[PDB]
């Protein structure tokens, strides 16, 4: 995405469903949120 | 005439295909059919409960005695088998699952493969030399199996390959029949191609209410000689019948000894003149239990309770029967149900003998 | 003698030379069962007795050399199995030359590597399960049809009415499946659906609780 | 190595030998599902 | 377990709520008390019946999980895609052949008589009669406009153990459901009696599915071509406002 | 899987060599560079008795006996000597001291157990005594499951000295408690082993190898596993292998219509019967080939 | 390491038509391969290699499991 | 070794006459291996 992009897709808006498949930028944004689940799950043991 | 309209069809190689023709002719010099071929048998049953048909199917699948090829302990000669990849476990797993149609338990084979070439040599099933027992006038297994492969300069020597008997439930190598069809001919079906009905089974009656008594069952046998197909399949069917009868007769020896304290039969006298019978038999499957429940239920329409609970982790079948009669009357009804099962499978025997010429 | 035998019997070079000797029958196909058979195998493979290996100084000079010397110049491209045999024999011969630091070695190594790469191409041809592509019938190649989202600038009439207010689609309009059922249509709120709608009705369209227009009739507004 | 180093951390004297314990007559295995067992029963 | 090939610690799936466990590869310790003093206290204090009610949230811990929650819904459902949800006498008895409780009396039934799931559930709840009346998880006003709810499935009522109407689901039989069926049984008959009914009602739910079936497929997730156009038309409105 | 193509030449610790491997019916571009590891097990997505709840699976016993996910598991024993103090040999009761209670020294041959014999718990696999008359520093096989001595050798270490190397092999089948997984990350533990006559079967005779709970999907949203079953079901009948690499153009609506063109249903579900009773389900069950892989977590070691 | 003797699912004797199915398949691929390197066959994006009729001519039934295991099983001889 | 093992790992000997536990053996102590100044050692 270009610098100072205005479209909502550039900021994590995934327009597609799982049954229809995601594109490369949508999968990267999904991995950004998916990695947080793995990180917070690890912290949910030690920090607790 | 419970069992009518049987049709038998072998599974044969189509030599009209050039690729298959050339491959077979240059591999095994094969230009005609193999000595042993699979056979699909479709059977129509009328006026019989689905419990009996399904029990016959189960017995033909993995409760009928059957023969395999096994290696005696010490048969795999470590002193001579120099191959590093054809381990004993792999080779014996290959050998156990070769479908055989044996005549006696005396035949003993041997596999002596020497690789004097510079390329990997494939050990086929035609390299099994019979070393003990009467000489075979007809092969007992197909010569086109792939037992293994040897690296250059390696060897594989195996002795004491004998024929072992067992039931398919204990080990899958004794499995006999593979399922190919099962349907009820007295229940209508929806067209399931439509998107309105593709989520349903298809039958127009729920299994919670339906009681079909006109079935079609089609089973495939993996190895039957070409010139005696009708002789083999018939035998198989007949065999199954005897097995079921035999097992049922075991229960018939329990009810006959209800006066003496017997571990496998327990009788209680409940309230309101109700009697309870618990029959616990070890190493029994859903076949005998389902047959017993179905025939007791048919014999006693107003029975208080009947169940055939077969427990996986207990390896046993517990049949509970609660009925508002006395102990003697309950035992009489149970014996009548057992006799009904016996006569039904005797009629199946007779129909099998009558149909397949 | 014991330490020398233990060292050499665990050398993969010894096993490879022994395999080559087994192929043409210089040593028995079975591994030795007695010390005499082991000594004979050592003498045939290494080429020197273990006693005399400790006396003299070389080691690689007299290791087995295959008996059949095929013509490897047909490796210059009943033929394919013979090609495999030639590949195996030349691999052994070149490995033995590498051990002995033979002159004119790197060029022959490169030539045989090219030959074995061609043979590997053939072997990979033999090792294909197959492949399939679901072709688009309209085209003649791999299907490109997808159910992905495609952006499209909808008219502003879909979000705002003719008075500039936003739409609030919150009235459910239900129409009778059969004609005889009356009334023909019922307009209910989400709270009243369970209390006024039965299976004799079907959801036709939504309605805005501000401008009172059907969602399917939103295009009749003047943009 | 020192005497007081044995005390502090998780693998120390207090948290590994006193607050915790290695015991005999105990078993460990992977758990599994079994719908024929009661809620107060273990296979 | 007399089978020599079994090396795992098997337990009921409804017992996982005590340990926050599952069967993805978890390992659990087990030691059998041998001292008389420790063996007495295990039976009286540390029995799992003492923690059916959570000491944390003061509510029940155990219930139906993932097959007897949807199994109880299908069993207690009023209408089946193949007509009314009834079963003959033979299949009504088959639902009670695994519960390991005493069987009910089916003598007052012809082989062609039909029994609905409410009657079958009732014969099991007569042992511990309770009073329950709530709205099941099946009913949701989110789904209401686009669904035709059955008026006999959105009101679960039980008086004296007789399931008068409604379906049984996570609200009534689910694990951790405060005020649920098993919470009421524990308060009136004891936590051990509630555990036996969890197992007993689990078997009817599982035995119903033995010939009713339950599956998930790819077409269960696929929008129709007309509905796909409606989904992206909705998303285009969001991108238009954005 | 095939953990190494030169496994027989190696003495490795805790290594499993699965005999049978299959290329997935829906392969990817990653299989152009590495060997696939797993089998195309026929999987039924159904509730069957409640033994597959909470991320468990039901495994056909016949599939186990035929070699499904079956292989050999290896362990090694590397024992060293003290130079001129210790030695390899069978001890004698009347000279050597503090022999291990309940041991079995009779299986030793010249200090090592011969290759091909079965060593069980309590057996002394390597004989070793230190000369003081003698003290017994023997090595005993402390494992519950019996092993088979696969390879015995006496190499020379970096210090030019003899040490004993023994390779023990284990015949491992798939048993209850072994962990399996799909390619979508839905792992599971084998819970029940049913015979070939107790597994459910379709009208056409198809029966599952694994029975997984349908409740494993909705919370984890592993849609690629369900699409793989739909695509792979048509590939088997059509006799083809297709590519399912990520970010390739797919249309599940078109893939579902491809099933009907092959004689199946649109949804891929089929009429099935209960193997224990012979009673058909009142619902078409989604059954098809899904590529499953055995994770190397053995209950016989944990 | 080879095509199984029997189908892993049901146990149909797949092995007795295994070897032939291997070799014949190769020529069929050679018919459809087309100006392409062998190791690049699974990346051609233009191939239509169908083995339905070959397996049918072998006499093997139209079972999903049997054809799946016949087609997809790897051969150790072809990689080592 | 008449009985190779009774499937139960035991670390103790028993009397052959009555069965009483004689003693137990798990491992050798091996602490006297260090028996009894780098200077005199370096000199020797
Ligand atoms: Zn408006
Ligand atoms: Zn099959």
What is the per-residue DSSP string for E117-157? Answer: HHHHHHHHHTSS--EEEE--TT--TTTGGGS---TTTS-EE
Residue C130, C-beta contacts closer than 8 angstroms, at least 6 positions apart: F240, F241, G25, G29, G41, G47, G49, G51, G71
Within chain D, strands assigned E span 27-33
Residue A13 contacts C where some CB pair is shorter than 8 Å: no
Packing angle of the helix pair B229-255, B327-355 (nearest 10 deg): 170
What is the least distance, in Å, from the CA of C155 to any CA of chain F? Answer: 28
Q: Chain E: nearest CA to A42, how far in angstroms?
A: 16
Contact of chains H and A by CB distance (3 or more pairs under 8 angstroms): no
Q: Which helix (H) or strand (E) holds C205?
A: strand C201-208
Q: CA H10 to CA H24: how far, in whole Å?
A: 9
E60 CA → ligand 1 middle, Å: 48
Point out the ligand nearest to the CA of residue C218: 1
Q: Which residues of G touch B16 (CB under 8 A)?
A: 57
What DSSP string runs through chain F?
----TTGGG---SSEEEES--B--SEE-GGGGTS---SEEEEEEEB--TTTTTTTEEEEEHHHHHTTTT-EEEEEEEEE---TTTEEES---TTTEESPPTT-B-TT-BTTBPPTTPEE-TTBEEE-EEEE--EEE--EE---SS-EEEEEEE--B-TTS-B-EEEEEEEEE---TT-EEEETTS-EEEEEEEE-TTTS-EETTS---SEEE-GGGHHHH--HHHHHHHHHHHHHHHHT--EE--TT----HHHHHHHHHHTTS-SS-EE-EE-TTT-PBPSS-EEEEEEEEEE-S--TTT-
Residues E165 and C72: their CA atoms lie apart, in Å, by: 89
Q: What angle is formed at CA C139 by the lines to CA C138 and CA C145, rounded to 5 degrees?
A: 75
User: Do G46 and C128 make contact, defined as CB atoms within 8 angstroms?
Assistant: no
Distance between Cα C164 and ligand 1 center (Å): 9
User: After which residues is the backbone of chain A broken at C–N > 2.5 Å?
Assistant: none
The helix (H) or strand (E) run that includes residue C169 is strand C169-176
Measured in residues, chain B has a length of 357
By DSSP bridging, strand E9-11 and strand D27-33 are: parallel
Report d(CA G57, CA G50) in Å as an integer. 13
Q: Do chains E and A touch (3 or more CB pairs under 8 A)?
A: yes
Going by their DSSP bridges, the two strands F56-60 and F210-212 should be labelled as antiparallel
E235 and chain C: CB distance < 8 Å anywhere?
Answer: yes
Chain G residues in contact with C122 (beta carbon < 8 A): 38
Q: Could you give the residue numbers annotated as active site of F?
A: 55
Cβ neighbours of residue F26 closer than 8 Å, sequence gap 6 or more: F228, F231, F232, F235, F241, F242, F243, F244, F291
**Which chain F residue is nearest to residue G54, measuring alpha carbons?**
F239
Span from the CA of B96 to the centroid of ligand 2 (angstroms): 17
Q: Which ligand is nearest to the CA of C207?
A: 1
What separation in Å is there between the alpha carbon of C161 and the centre of ligand 1? 5
CB-based touch B/F (3+ pairs, under 8 A)? yes
Q: Which residues of F touch D30 (CB under 8 A)?
A: 177, 189, 299, 302
d(Cα G5, Cα C21) in Å, to the nearest integer? 34
Interchain proximity F102–H28, CB inside 8 Å = no
Contact G76/B85, CB-based, under 8 Å? yes
C residues 144-183 closer than 8 Å to A (CB): 146-149, 151
What does the block give as tokens for B18? Answer: 């050039």
The answer to whether the CB atoms of C194 and E241 lie below 8 A apart is no
Question: Which residues are CB-contacts of F67 (< 8 A; sequence separation ≥ 6)?
Answer: B93, F19, F20, G4, G8
3-state secondary structure of C217: coil
- DSSP structural state of residue G41: G
F62 neighbors F196 (Cβ within 8 angstroms): yes
Residue E242 near chain A (CB below 8 Å): yes
How many CB atoms are closer than 10 A to CB F189? 28
A interface with E, Cβ–Cβ < 8 A, is 8, 13, 15, 17, 19
Resolution (A): 3.7
Give me the sign of the Cα torsion angle F100, F103, F109, F114. negative
Give B 319-348 residues with CB within 8 A of chain E.
320, 322, 324
DSSP for B301-318?
Answer: TT-SEEE--EETTTTEEE
Question: Which among E7, C48, B270 has a CA at the least distance from the CA of F193?
Answer: E7
Residue E40 CB contacts under 8 Å (≥ 6 apart), including other chains: none
CB contact under 8 A, D34 and B311: no
Interface residue G40 vs chain C (CB under 8 A): no
**Contact assignment for E29 to D28 by CB distance below 8 Å:** yes
Strand, coil or helix: what is C48? Answer: coil
Q: Which of E222, E232, E239 sits opposite A8 (nearest CB)?
A: E239
Which H or E element spans position E189? helix E181-189
Strand partners, F25: none
Nearest ligand for residue C166 CA: 1
Calculate the dihedral angle through the C-alpha atoms of D31, D33, D34, D35, rounding to the nearest 10 degrees: 150
Q: In angstroms, rounded to a whole number, what is the distance separating the alpha carbons of residues F32 and F28?
A: 8
DSSP B6-65: EEEEE----TTSHHHHHHHHHHT---S--SEEEEEEEEEEESS-HHHHHHHHHHHHHTSE
Rounded Cα distance between B46 and B42, Å, is 14
In this structure, what DSSP letter does residue B213 have?
Answer: -
Which residues are CB-neighbours of F77 under 8 A, at least 6 positions away? F125, F126, F139, F164, F165, F166, F167, F168
In terms of C-beta density within 10 A (0-12 exposed, 13-18 middle, 19 or more buried), how is residue B46 classed?
Answer: middle
D interface test, pick of F174, F189, F212 with most D CB neighbours within 10 Å = F189
Question: What is the Cα–Cα distance from G2 to B90, expressed in whole angstroms?
Answer: 10
G62–C contact, CB cutoff 8 A:
no
H or E, element range at C172:
strand C169-176
d(CA F35, CA F1): 9
State how far the Cα of B326 lies from the Cα of B269, in Å rounded to an integer: 8
- Prior bond of E190 cis (ω within 30°): no
Q: In sequence order, which residues have a C-beta less than 8 Å from that of residue C173 and are 6 or more positions away?
A: C185, C186, C187, C203, C204, C205, C206, C207, C214
Structural tokens at position C221 = 């507004």
Tell me the CA distances in angstroms from E168 to E77, F118, F179, one per residue in order.
8, 56, 33
CA G68 to centroid of ligand 2, rounded, Å = 8
Q: Which of B17, B27, B122 sits opposite G57 (nearest CB)?
A: B17
- What does DSSP assign to residue E59? S
Q: Do B206 and F195 touch (CB under 8 A)?
A: no
Q: Does C84 touch chain B (CB under 8 A)?
A: yes
F189: contact with D, CB 8 A cutoff: yes
Tell me the residue length of chain E.
242
Which residues does C140 contact at the CB level (< 8 Å), separation at least 6?
Answer: none
Contact partners, residue E19, CB within 8 Å, separation at least 6: E28
Beta strands F210-212 and F39-45 are parallel
Is F97 within 8 Å of chain H by CB? no
Q: Which chains touch A (3 or more CB pairs under 8 A)?
A: C, E, F
> What are the DSSP calls for B264-326, one per residue?
TEEEEE-STT-EEEEEEEET--HHHHHHHHHHHHHH-TT-SEEE--EETTTTEEEEEEEESS-
Alpha helices in chain G (DSSP H): 18-32, 52-57, 64-72
CA dist., res. E84 & res. B206, Å (int): 10
* Residue B342 CB neighbours (<10 A): 15
The answer to whether the beta carbons of residues F105 and F91 sit under 8 Å apart is yes
Q: Which of C25, C29, C89 sits opposite B82 (nearest CB)?
A: C29
Looking at residue C215, what DSSP letter applies? Answer: S
User: Could you tell me which chain F residue has the CA closest to the CA of E207?
Assistant: F49
- The alpha carbon of C149 and the centre of ligand 1 are apart by a number of angstroms equal to 26
CA of G6 to the centre of ligand 2 (A): 8
CB contact under 8 A, A19 and E239: no
> How close C119 comes to chain G (CA, Å)?
12
- DSSP states of F73-118 as a string? EEEEEEE---TTTEEES---TTTEESPPTT-B-TT-BTTBPPTTPE
């Amino acid at each position: 995405y270009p610098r100072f992009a205005l479209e909502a897709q550039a900021y994590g808006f995934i327009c597609n469903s799982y049954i229809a498949g995601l594109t490369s930028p949508e999968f990267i944004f999904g991995e950004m949120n998916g990695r947080f689940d793995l990180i917070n799950k690890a912290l949910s043991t030690s920090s607790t | 005439k419970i069992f009518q309209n049987v049709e038998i069809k072998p599974f044969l190689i189509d030599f009209s295909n050039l690729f298959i023709k050339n491959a077979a002719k240059k591999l095994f010099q094969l230009e005609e059919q193999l000595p042993l071929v699979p056979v699909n048998v479709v059977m129509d049953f009328k006026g019989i409960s689905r419990a009996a048909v399904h029990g016959l199917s189960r017995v033909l699948q993995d409760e009928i005695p059957n023969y395999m090829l096994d290696i005696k302990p010490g048969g795999y000669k470590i002193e001579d088998s120099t191959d590093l990849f054809m381990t004993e476990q792999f080779i014996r797993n290959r050998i156990n699952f070769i479908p055989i149609y044996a005549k006696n338990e005396t035949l003993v084979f041997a596999l002596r493969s020497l690789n004097n070439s510079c390329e990997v040599k494939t050990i086929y099933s035609r390299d099994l030399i019979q070393v003990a027992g009467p000489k075979l006038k007809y092969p007992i297994f197909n010569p086109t199996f792939e037992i293994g492969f040897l690296q250059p300069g390696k060897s594989l020597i195996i002795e004491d390959i004998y024929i072992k008997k067992g039931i398919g439930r204990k080990h899958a190598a004794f499995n006999l029949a593979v399922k190919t069809h099962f349907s009820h001919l007295d229940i209508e079906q929806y067209p399931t191609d439509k998107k309105e009905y593709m989520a349903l089974s298809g039958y127009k009656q729920s299994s919670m209410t339906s009681d079909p008594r006109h079935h079609r069952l089609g089973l495939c046998f993996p190895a039957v000689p070409l010139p005696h197909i009708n002789q083999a399949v018939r035998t198989y069917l007949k065999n199954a019948c005897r097995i079921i009868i035999g097992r049922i007769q075991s229960i018939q020896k329990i009810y006959e000894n209800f006066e003496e304290p017997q571990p496998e039969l327990v009788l209680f006298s409940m309230d309101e003149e109700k009697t309870k019978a618990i029959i616990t038999i070890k190493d029994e499957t859903h076949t005998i239990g389902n047959l017993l429940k179905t025939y007791i239920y048919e014999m006693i329409p107003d029975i208080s309770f009947v169940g055939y609970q077969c427990v996986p982790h207990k390896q046993e079948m517990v049949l509970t029967i609660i009925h508002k009669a006395s102990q003697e009357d309950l035992i009489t009804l149970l014996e009548k149900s057992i006799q009904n099962i016996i006569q039904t499978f005797q009629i199946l025997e007779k129909n099998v003998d009558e149909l397949i010429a | 003698t014991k330490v020398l035998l233990t060292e050499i019997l665990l050398d993969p070079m010894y096993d490879y030379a022994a395999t080559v000797a087994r192929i043409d029958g210089s040593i028995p196909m079975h591994k030795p069962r007695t010390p005499k058979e082991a000594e004979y195998e050592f003498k045939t493979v290494i080429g020197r007795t273990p006693a005399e290996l400790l006396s003299q100084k070389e080691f690689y000079d007299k290791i087995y050399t295959s008996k059949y010397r095929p013509d490897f110049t047909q490796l210059t491209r009943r033929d394919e199995e013979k090609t495999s045999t030639l590949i195996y024999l030349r691999a052994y011969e070149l490995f033995l030359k590498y051990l002995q630091n033979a002159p004119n070695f790197n060029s022959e190594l490169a030539e045989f590597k090219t030959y074995e790469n061609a043979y590997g191409e053939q072997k990979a041809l033999l090792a294909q399960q197959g492949f399939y592509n679901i072709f688009d019938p309209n085209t003649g190649r791999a299907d490109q049809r997808t159910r992905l989202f495609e952006y499209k600038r909808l008219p502003i009439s879909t979000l705002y009415d003719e008075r500039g207010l936003p739409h609030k689609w919150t009235i459910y309009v239900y129409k009778a499946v059969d004609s005889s059922q009356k009334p023909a249509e019922i307009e209910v709120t989400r709270k009243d659906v369970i209390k006024k709608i039965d299976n004799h009705y079907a959801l036709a369209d939504l309605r805005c609780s501000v401008c009172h227009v059907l969602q399917h009739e939103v295009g009749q507004l003047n943009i | 190595p020192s005497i007081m180093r044995r005390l502090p951390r998780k693998e120390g004297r207090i948290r590994k030998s006193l607050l915790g314990s290695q015991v005999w007559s105990i078993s460990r295995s992977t758990i599994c599902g079994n719908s024929d067992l009661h809620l107060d029963e273990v296979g | 377990l007399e089978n020599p090939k079994i090396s795992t610690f098997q337990m009921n799936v409804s017992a996982c709520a005590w340990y926050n466990a599952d069967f993805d590869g978890d390992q659990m310790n087990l030691w059998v008390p041998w001292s008389v003093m420790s063996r007495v206290e295990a039976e009286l204090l540390c029995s799992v019946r003492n923690w059916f009610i959570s000491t944390k949230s003061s509510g029940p811990v155990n219930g139906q999980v993932q097959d007897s929650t949807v199994g109880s819904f299908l069993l207690t459902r009023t209408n089946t895609p193949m007509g009314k949800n009834v079963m003959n006498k033979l299949h009504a008895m088959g639902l009670f052949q695994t519960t390991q409780t005493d069987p009910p009396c089916f003598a007052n039934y012809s082989p062609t008589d039909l029994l609905d799931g409410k009657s079958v559930v009732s014969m099991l709840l007569r042992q511990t009669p309770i009073n329950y009346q709530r709205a099941p998880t099946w009913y949701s006003e989110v789904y209401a406009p686009y669904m035709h709810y059955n008026k006999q499935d959105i009101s679960t009522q039980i008086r004296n153990g007789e399931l008068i109407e409604g379906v049984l689901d996570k609200k009534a039989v689910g694990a951790g459901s405060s005020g649920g069926i098993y919470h009421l049984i524990s308060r009136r008959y004891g936590p051990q009696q509630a555990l036996k009914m969890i197992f007993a009602t689990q078997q009817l739910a599982l035995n119903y599915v033995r010939n009713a079936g339950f599956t998930v497929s790819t077409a269960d997730m696929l929008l129709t071509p007309e509905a796909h156009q409606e989904v992206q038309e909705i998303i285009n409105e969001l991108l238009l406002e954005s | 899987g095939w953990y190494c193509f030169s496994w027989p030449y190696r003495v490795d610790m805790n290594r499993f060599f699965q005999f049978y491997n299959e290329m997935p019916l829906v392969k990817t571009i990653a299989h152009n560079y590495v060997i696939p590891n797993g089998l195309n097990t026929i999987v039924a997505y159904m509730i069957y008795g409640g033994y597959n709840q909470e991320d468990s699976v039901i495994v056909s016993q016949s599939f186990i006996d035929r070699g499904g996910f079956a292989g050999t598991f290896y362990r090694e024993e590397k024992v060293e000597l003290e130079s001129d103090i210790e030695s390899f040999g069978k001890p004698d009761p009347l000279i050597t001291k503090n022999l291990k209670p309940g041991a079995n020294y009779e299986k030793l041959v010249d200090g090592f157990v011969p290759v091909g014999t079965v060593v069980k718990k309590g057996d002394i696999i390597i004989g070793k005594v230190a000369k003081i008359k003698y003290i017994d520093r023997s090595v005993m096989y402390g494992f519950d499951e019996p092993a088979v001595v696969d390879a015995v050798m006496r190499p020379h270490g970096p210090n030019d000295e003899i040490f004993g190397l023994m390779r023990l092999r284990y015949e491992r089948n798939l048993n209850i408690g072994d962990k399996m997984s799909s390619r979508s990350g839905n792992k599971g533990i084998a819970a029940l082993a049913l015979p070939t006559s107790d597994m459910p079967f379709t009208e056409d005779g198809l029966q599952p190898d694994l029975i997984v709970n349908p409740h494993s999907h909705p919370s984890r949203m592993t849609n690629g596993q369900m699409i793989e079953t739909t695509v792979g079901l048509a590939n088997a009948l059509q006799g083809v292998v297709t590519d399912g690499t990520a970010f390739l153009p797919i249309n599940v609506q078109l893939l579902s219509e491809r099933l009907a063109q092959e004689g199946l249903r649109f949804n891929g579900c089929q009429k099935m019967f209960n193997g224990q009773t012979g009673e058909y389900f009142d619902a078409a069950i989604f059954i098809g080939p899904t590529y499953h892989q055995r994770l190397q977590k053995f209950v016989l070691d944990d | 390491m080879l095509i199984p003797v029997v189908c892993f699912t049901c146990g149909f004797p797949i092995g007795t038509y295994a070897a032939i199915f291997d070799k014949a398949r190769t020529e069929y691929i050679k018919t459809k391969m087309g100006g392409t390197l062998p190791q690049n066959i699974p990346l051609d994006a233009s191939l239509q290699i169908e083995l339905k009729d070959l397996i049918t001519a072998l006499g093997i039934p139209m079972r999903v499991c049997c054809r799946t295991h016949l087609i997809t099983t790897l051969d150790y001889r072809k990689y080592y | 070794k008449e009985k190779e093992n009774n499937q139960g790992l035991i670390y103790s000997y028993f009397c052959k006459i009555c069965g009483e536990e004689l003693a137990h053996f798990i491992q050798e102590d091996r602490t006297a291996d260090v028996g009894i100044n780098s200077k005199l050692r370096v000199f020797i």
